[PDB]
Design a protein around this ligand. Structure first.
Ligand SMILES: Oc1ccccc1-c1ccccc1O
Length: 156
């Protein structure tokens, strides 16, 4: 997809020039060793002063041939404990759905910062996983204890 590949090259150029500290976003490779702009390996650092602090959370960003008509699928690998992350690892976020808040102009930086924001502020009106959501609603202290354990587990 010429349109997708052209935009992804622009995203890569912009990201390399200016990106938030501690974040990573790099295209993967094809079997022949060439760059695969359709599949990116990324990492989001937990925000300082939050229960996520010190964690580095890996996720994959997968683009469809019609990007930027469609948002990428963003998937934590491995899956994370969080009310808006499906058990598969897929992130549930309004800007990541075409018929909700996705706009073609949204950048990879905006996506990764949006997901970082989501990590520390769940949206209780769109639960994606039963366990983290139930704990978040029933016992915030227990919820944060689980989050801190997870951040420690994913410390670099
Ligand atoms: O290991 C990483 C280090 C830095 C950024 C991303 C990854 C990664 C992200 C998703 C899937 C695999 C991966 O290796």
């Amino acid at each position: 997809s010429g349109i997708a590949l052209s935009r992804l090259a622009q995203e890569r150029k912009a990201w390399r020039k200016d990106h938030p500290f501690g974040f990573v976003a790099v295209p993967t490779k094809n079997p022949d060793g060439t760059m695969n702009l359709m599949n990116w390996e990324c990492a989001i650092p937990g925000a300082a002063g939050t229960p996520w602090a010190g964690g580095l959370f890996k996720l994959r960003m997968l683009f469809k041939d019609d990007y930027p008509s469609s948002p990428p699928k963003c998937k934590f690998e491995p899956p994370l404990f969080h009310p808006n992350v499906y058990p598969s690892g897929t992130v549930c976020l309004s800007i990541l759905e075409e018929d909700k808040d996705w706009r073609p102009a949204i950048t990879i930086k905006q996506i990764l910062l949006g997901i970082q924001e989501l990590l520390n502020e769940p949206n209780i009106q769109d639960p994606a996983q039963a366990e983290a959501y139930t704990i978040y609603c029933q016992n915030r202290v227990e919820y944060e204890k689980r989050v801190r354990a997870q951040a420690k587990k994913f410390a670099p």
